[PDB]
Amino acid sequence: ETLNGGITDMLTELANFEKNVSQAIHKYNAYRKAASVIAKYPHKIKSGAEAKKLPGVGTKIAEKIDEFLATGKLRKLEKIRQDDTSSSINFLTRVSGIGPSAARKFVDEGIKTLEDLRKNEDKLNHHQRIGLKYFGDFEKRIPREEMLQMQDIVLNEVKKVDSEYIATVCGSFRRGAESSGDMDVLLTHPSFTSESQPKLLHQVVEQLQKVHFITDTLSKGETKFMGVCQLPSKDEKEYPHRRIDIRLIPKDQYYCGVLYFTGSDIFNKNMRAHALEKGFTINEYTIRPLGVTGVAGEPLPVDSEKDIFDYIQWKYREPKDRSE
DNA sequence: CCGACGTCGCATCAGC
DNA sequence: GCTGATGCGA
DNA sequence: GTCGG
Ligand SMILES: Cc1cn([C@H]2C[C@H](O)[C@@H](COP(=O)(O)NP(=O)(O)OP(=O)(O)O)O2)c(=O)[nH]c1=O
Ligand SMILES: [Mg+2]
Ligand SMILES: [Mg+2]
Ligand code: NA
Ligand code: NA
């Protein structure tokens, strides 16, 4: 459970400062990877040396663990926690649309809190204003029961627009999780293929707006929608606003997309690793046979999830068991 | 020693 | 005004 | 920061 919580909390804090303040994205992923492998380690760690055996834990982190075990803290982490500039930069990045660079410029000109952002609207782009407005809501998870109600609305409205649409809610929801961070909707239509309107996505977004399910828009192109939605108010407390993505994908790429965006991260590259072990390369869009040469062949037809499993020596697995 | 470390759509900026 | 670069999220 | 060619 929280067997090494102090250690993994420490490493996660370190990770965020690397990304958000130091702008060192690879150190960010290094720390997270370290925190991940430790989180799954089934023993209360006794030394940095014990930890270093794990893939992703090196000399520096082994050292930091030693300091944490001896003193209950890290001098460097304590110090940066207390730094007004650095802690403010790291905090502002919690607002969707504010990345490390925007957070930096804000703190440079004295803008450090949500309140400061509130009285400085004209310095905010469209995404950032939405991120600010739903700061709290965007940090809540979504009970699976609300996700089902959300799914009810999306499948109904999609079919209403055109009964030949195919939509699938992917991500942690499809894997059967008890809660979700967002709603990932994948969309296709038999008239849409790789060698094939901009309206296929627009019409679906517009209908979800008409019935007031979709409430705001972060981005909307011809293939990808990123926005905000909310279940109707049950004389009751209103539901939090939620993040929803809608992806339009060609029919011949749809099920690679569904497999991909169902995950999990770790599960899927085990699956990709195993796939190439046999001369097939899997990506988001396609699956493709390698030659003796290493040259990829032309992409192969896929018409179900299970299809890809059959191309590559694997019995189809339920979404329910796809953590790894 | 020292380069890789994931990738890509969309919004918006920077250069011309 | 057009094209490529950058910031961002996931 | 860690790994590995
Ligand atoms: C965006 C993205 C997603 N994925 C897979 C893994 C995730 O399980 C799945 C959906 O992405 P997610 O919404 O970022 N994470 P999640 O849906 O699994 O969990 P959550 O409840 O949204 O937090 O897509 C990748 O493997 N590479 C990616 O770049
Ligand atoms: Mg998700
Ligand atoms: Mg997502
Ligand atoms: Na090691
Ligand atoms: Na942010």
**Cα(A274)–Cα(A287) distance, integer angstroms:** 13
Nucleotide nearest to A201 (CA to C1'): B9
A105 Cα–ligand 5 center, Å: 13
A284 Cα–ligand 1 center, Å: 12
Residue A130 and residue A148 in one domain: no
Task: Answer yes or no: are the C-beta atoms of A183 and A245 closer than 8 Å.
Answer: yes
DSSP output for A248-265 = E--GGGHHHHHHHTT--H
Say which residue the tokens 């019409």 belong to: A203
Encoding tokens for residue A1? 């459970």
Residue A279 and residue A243 in one domain: no
Residue A188, strand partner residues: A166
Atom of ligand 1 nearest to the CA of A141: 21
Residue A145 and residue A245 in one domain: yes
**Cα(A1)–Cα(A3) distance, integer angstroms:** 5
**Beta strand ranges found along A269-308 (DSSP E):** 280-282, 287-289
Q: How far is the CA of A29 from the C1' of B5 (A)?
A: 8
Neighbours of ion ligand 5 (CB under 5 A): A 93, 98
Alpha carbon separation from A205 to A37, A219, A294 (Å, rounded): 40, 11, 42
Q: Whats the size of chain A, residue-wise?
A: 324
Q: How far is the CA of A121 from the C1' of C1 (A)?
A: 29
Boundary of a domain, candidates A260, A282, A304 = A260
Residue A199 and residue A234 in one domain: yes
For residue A57, what are the contacts with CB-CB under 8 A and spacing of at least 6? A34, A37, A38, A51
Alpha carbon separation from A174 to A35, A102, A222, A229, A259 (Å, rounded): 26, 34, 25, 19, 10
Count of beta carbons in the 10 Å neighbourhood of residue A2: 8
Rounded to a whole number of angstroms, the CA Rg of chain A reads 23
Q: How far is the CA of A27 from the C1' of B5 (A)?
A: 9
Range of the domain at A22: 4-83
Answer yes or no: A64 catalytic: yes
Task: Answer yes or no: are the C-beta atoms of A144 and A155 closer than 8 Å.
Answer: no
Alpha carbon separation from A76 to A17, A45, A133, A241 (Å, rounded): 11, 21, 33, 37
Residue A256 and residue A155 in one domain: yes
Residue A74 and residue A24 in one domain: yes
Residue A202 and residue A265 in one domain: no
The one catalytic residue in A64, A133, A278, A306 is A64
Domain CATH number, residue A281: 3.30.210.10
Asked if strand D contacts A261 at the CB level, meaning under 7 A, the answer is: no
**Cα(A225)–Cα(A301) distance, integer angstroms:** 26
Strand C, nucleotides < 7 Å from a protein CB: these are 6-10
- Tell me the residue type at A138: F
Q: Tell which residue, A221, A212, A220, A225, has the closest CA to residue A183.
A: A225
Determined by which method? X-ray
Residue A34 and residue A66 in one domain: yes
Domain CATH number, residue A177: 3.30.460.10
Q: Tell which residue, A37, A36, A66, A33, has the closest CA to residue A49.
A: A66
A159 Cα–ligand 4 center, Å: 52
**Nearest residue (CA) to ligand 1, atom 2:** A261
Q: Tell which residue, A59, A32, A46, has the closest CA to residue A4.
A: A46
Is the beta carbon of A182 within 6 A of some atom in ligand 1?
yes
Residue A235 and residue A275 in one domain: no
**Cα(A141)–Cα(A296) distance, integer angstroms:** 41
Instruction: Give A209-216 contacts, CB < 8 A, sequence gap 24+.
Output: A211/A153, A211/A157, A213/A153, A213/A154, A213/A157, A214/A244, A215/A241, A216/A130, A216/A133, A216/A134, A216/A241
Count of beta carbons in the 10 Å neighbourhood of residue A190: 10
Backbone phi, psi, residue A123, to 5°? -95, 5
DSSP output for A74-125 = -HHHHHHHH-HHHHHHHHHTTSTT--HHHHHHHHHTT--SHHHHHT-GGGS-
Task: Answer yes or no: are the C-beta atoms of A92 and A117 closer than 8 Å.
Answer: yes
Nucleotide nearest to A60 (CA to C1'): D1
Domain CATH number, residue A88: 1.10.150.20
Nucleotide nearest to A30 (CA to C1'): D1
Residue A112 and residue A59 in one domain: no
Domain CATH number, residue A68: 1.10.150.110
Q: Is A122 exposed, middle or buried (0-12, 13-18, 19+ CB in 10 A)?
A: exposed
Q: Annotated binding residues of A for Mg(2+), as ranges? A: 182, 184, 245
Residue A167 and residue A213 in one domain: yes
Residue A216, strand partner residues: A228
Boundary of a domain, candidates A229, A260, A291 = A260
Domains held by chain A: number: 4
Boundary of a domain, candidates A238, A260, A282 = A260
- Pairing outcome for strands A242-248 and A183-188: parallel
Residue A217 and residue A130 in one domain: no
Alpha carbon separation from A186 to A34, A123, A160, A189 (Å, rounded): 32, 34, 16, 11
Is the preceding omega at residue A36 within 30 degrees of 0, hence cis? no
